[PDB]
């Protein structure tokens, strides 16, 4: 009457493929060992809690977004504020850096992810295009290319935007709940999103359809990140647990959680080799997880408020973290 | 002496940007942030002066910034925390709407929905120390309706006179009773009406009282 049999048909097929868990394979893998993470550059100047931060492709420039209405691009090595962008909307919740480094996107409660062009003859950051059209707050905006940007919004829909056209090229509506985070694959052909429905769905950019759905999390998914190989991605939720999903397996392979952790997870990232899982936790701390053995190989501290955003450099040599205390610290 | 000339220029630009950011922060600090929730919201906004709408109104030399979170049908558990630190929360309800059912196969009532929202906002963890400026709008229509139809339809257990004063007082007390942390936060209630500055002055008085009480608490006196 209402597709009763279909649900279990997928369930049985997914169950049948479980032969050996990831834990068994990684028994012979040596542990990472203690990671002597220490703060090297303390980027400060934000006067309000920050929510999003994204590294540049050069691994030196990074963009920071804060509710104070100011977007600051930081020079990691010299700690210099290369640019300051006064946002018209003072409720930004997401930011992105174009791979070419020419454009910056900012979005939040306002239903717009404004595109900011850094490279101008007049030498100022002026709004290039305003991607209005969402019915709810924008949760995450990420650039596939310098002209195409994918957006996540609380209206339960993700959208592909042709920046030149200023209209949604494709709308993703399979989520039965608000979408919180968005991550792009290395090839940019496909992306994934997380939702408050405690599930993540695989989205193909050009055909505009869902390929797979994952529902391991018990609560809302807050952050997601693609594995460097591109065949898997990790997701963080309010469950206080991080989960790894393999696209070719359609099944969760391992859970990263501890008994002493009860608060939700706010950020997720991978190292260049993919062995380290940088998860930002609501308890003012970031825990480093052995992606293969699912063990706490290290921990980061020094934040006086909730950790909001973090990201590893494409060079893989340092990781920056963001917190509501308004301080950005880079660890190497 | 280990920095080149371009590095020195970059440092100068960075410190100038820092000065500009500090100046902007100082400008923003001297402002009052009020959250509007609710039902006469448009009428209250008019009398006071798809996403978040900001209204800036200055009264008695104090600048007030009111952010309207209306039209955001998305779950509020994921963006309500962005409003931490607001001096006061303006919650507006319509008295005349006790007889309305908000459609939906009459599964809810507008007064019940309003009280549920008020309880959720007041008992929210982020607002454990935020005063609420409760507004009861549409008093004239409330009186006109209670003249014919008693409010007991919305309140099965209220056995009392149907006069305007008693019914309004009972509704106000019912809204007040939702406070589970009455000691920490004050709930200002006003029968707003829709004429003159009777709302702007009440908001100003509530803000002044909240500020004074917070200052006294800081010293430990109050």
């Amino acid at each position, epitope marked *: 009457q209402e597709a009763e049999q279909l649900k279990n048909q997928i369930r049985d097929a997914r169950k049948a493929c479980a032969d050996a868990t990831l834990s068994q394979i990684t028994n012979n893998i040596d542990p990472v060992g203690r990671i002597q993470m220490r703060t090297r550059r303390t980027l400060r100047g934000h006067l309000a809690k920050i929510y999003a931060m994204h590294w540049g492709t050069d691994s030196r420039l990074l963009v920071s977004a804060s509710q104070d209405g100011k977007l600051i691009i930081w020079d990691s090595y010299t700690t*210099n504020k290369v640019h300051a962008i006064p946002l018209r909307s003072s409720w930004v919740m997401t930011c992105a850096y174009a791979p070419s*480094g020419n454009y910056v996107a900012c979005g939040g409660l306002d239903n717009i992810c404004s595109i900011y062009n850094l490279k101008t*003859r007049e030498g*100022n950051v002026r709004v290039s295009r305003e991607l209005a059209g969402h019915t709810g707050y924008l949760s995450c905006c990420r650039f596939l290319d310098d002209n195409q940007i994918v957006t996540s919004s609380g209206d339960t829909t993700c959208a592909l935007w042709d920046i030149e056209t200023g209209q949604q090229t494709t709308t993703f509506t399979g989520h039965t709940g608000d979408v919180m985070s968005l991550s792009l694959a290395p090839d940019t052909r496909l992306f994934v999103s997380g939702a408050c429905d405690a599930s993540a769905k695989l989205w193909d950019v050009r055909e505009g359809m869902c390929r797979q759905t994952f529902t391991g999390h018990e609560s809302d998914i807050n952050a997601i990140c693609f594995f460097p190989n591109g065949n898997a991605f990790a997701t963080g939720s309010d469950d206080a647990t991080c989960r790894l999903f393999d696209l070719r397996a359609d099944q969760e392979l391992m859970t990263y959680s501890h008994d002493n952790i009860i608060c939700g997870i706010t950020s997720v990232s991978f190292s260049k080799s993919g062995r380290l899982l940088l998860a930002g936790y609501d308890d003012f701390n970031c825990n480093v997880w052995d992606a293969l053995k699912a063990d706490r190989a290290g921990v980061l501290a020094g934040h006086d408020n909730r950790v909001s955003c973090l990201g590893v450099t494409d060079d893989g040599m340092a990781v920056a973290t963001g917190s509501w205390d308004s301080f950005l610290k880079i660890w190497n | 002496c280990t920095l080149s000339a*371009e590095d020195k220029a970059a440092v100068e*630009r960075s410190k*100038m940007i820092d000065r500009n950011l500090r100046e902007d922060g100082e400008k923003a600090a001297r402002e009052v942030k009020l959250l509007l929730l609710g039902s006469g919201k448009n009428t209250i906004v008019k009398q006071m002066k798809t996403g978040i709408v900001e209204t800036h109104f200055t009264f008695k030399d104090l600048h007030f910034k009111m952010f309207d979170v209306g039209a955001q049908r998305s779950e509020r558990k994921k963006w309500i925390h962005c409003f931490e630190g607001v001096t006061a929360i303006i919650f507006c309800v319509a008295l005349s709407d006790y007889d309305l059912v908000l459609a939906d196969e009459a599964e809810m009532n507008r007064m019940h929905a309003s009280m549920k929202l008020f309880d959720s906002i007041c008992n929210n963890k982020w607002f454990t120390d935020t005063s609420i400026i409760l507004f009861l709008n549409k008093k004239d229509l409330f009186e006109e309706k209670i003249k014919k139809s008693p409010l007991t339809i919305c309140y099965p257990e209220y056995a009392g006179s149907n006069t305007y004063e008693e019914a309004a007082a009972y509704i106000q007390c019912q809204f007040e009773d939702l406070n589970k942390r009455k000691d920490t936060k004050e709930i200002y209630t006003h029968f707003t009406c829709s004429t003159d500055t009777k709302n702007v002055q009440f908001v100003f008085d509530a803000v002044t009282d909240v500020i004074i009480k917070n200052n006294l608490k800081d010293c430990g006196l109050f």
Partner: single-chain antibody
Amino acid sequence: VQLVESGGGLVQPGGSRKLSCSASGFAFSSFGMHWVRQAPEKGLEWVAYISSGSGTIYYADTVKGRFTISRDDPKNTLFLQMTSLRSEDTAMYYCVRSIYYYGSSPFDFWGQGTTLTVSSADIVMTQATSSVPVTPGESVSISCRSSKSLLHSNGNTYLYWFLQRPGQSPQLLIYRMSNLASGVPDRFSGSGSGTAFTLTISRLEAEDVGVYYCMQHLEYPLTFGAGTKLEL
């Protein structure tokens, strides 16, 4: 973007004249300003510098004291006071704008300048050839040398290549010895060692004819080479 200079004219020795530049099309406050002179039938020479906010002000040895610079951010105009003009001061001053941050392009725009007709550890930049006869469609290479290593420990080679076509202001081609300036053909390319630098034109065109100049920015006493004059 446009920069227009004013105040040029004939001044007798010992007089004082102020040269003013008007900005239009960009944020004058954000950009820094420079003054580069060019004596008739001669090369370039940096004159003075002022940074955004007037915090940093520098002058060349030959003009320090006599010449002072100031900025007026509200009006978007630059001023360069000149006192006790000497016969050596007879040159056409060009106003330049630079912005200093990672990935920036200092000296990315040059004005038409204002003509003025009057009457030590410095890194000297020397160019091998003053002029080189060339023909269109043939690769052309220009080499310059520096007395001191311009490659700082940060890893950036502070070499700037400027092209000044006949009857036109200088144009920036390469600003850090490896990066092409905005609005320039990809034909131009830059390469060199810590002390030797070379500018290669992949295929010479008609517009390429002009005088090529080099500059060092590691130390603020900027020095310009004699220049390479390509002719068809």
